[PDB]
Amino acid sequence: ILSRLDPPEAEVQIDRLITGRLQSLQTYVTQQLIRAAEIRASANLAAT
Amino acid sequence: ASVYAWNRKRISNCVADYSVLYNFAPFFTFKCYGVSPTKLNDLCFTNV
């Protein structure tokens, strides 16, 4: 982006990519919490 | 050329100092889309 663009416009383009990839991390972590509750319920059954 | 029969010169295998342009201020107009003229002087393309 920088190699072929000025800062005033490069800040906007990088901010779009940051938002997109930050949404990726929120999706990932939310699913790990929901899936970890399921394996935890299974570990409770196995311990019982 | 006439615009209806516009002329196309293909560029290859050379080193362009795009900074030769920009100069000659009194009636040049520069309007770059997708990048500036400072950032691409440190860039490369297959064909211009």
Unique residue bearing structure tokens 């990088």: A14
Question: What values do phi and psi take at B22, rounded to 5?
Answer: 60, -40
The DSSP result for A16-43, as a single string, is HHHHHHHHHHHHHHHHHHHHHHHHHHHH
Token pair of A33 as six digits: 């919490």
Which experimental method was this entry solved with?
Answer: cryo-EM
CB atoms A3 and B38 under 8 Å:
no
Reported residue count of chain B is 48
Q: Give CA B44 to chain center in angstroms.
A: 13
What's A5's DSSP letter?
Answer: S
How open is the CA angle A11-A7-B32, to the nearest 5 degrees?
Answer: 115
A21 touches chain B (CB under 8 A): no
The set of residues, in sequence order, having a beta carbon less than 8 Å from that of A5 and lying 6+ positions away, is A13, B34, B35, B36, B39
Closest CA to B44 of B5, B10, B18, B9: B18
A6 touches chain B (CB under 8 A): yes
Token pair of B16 as six digits: 């362009």
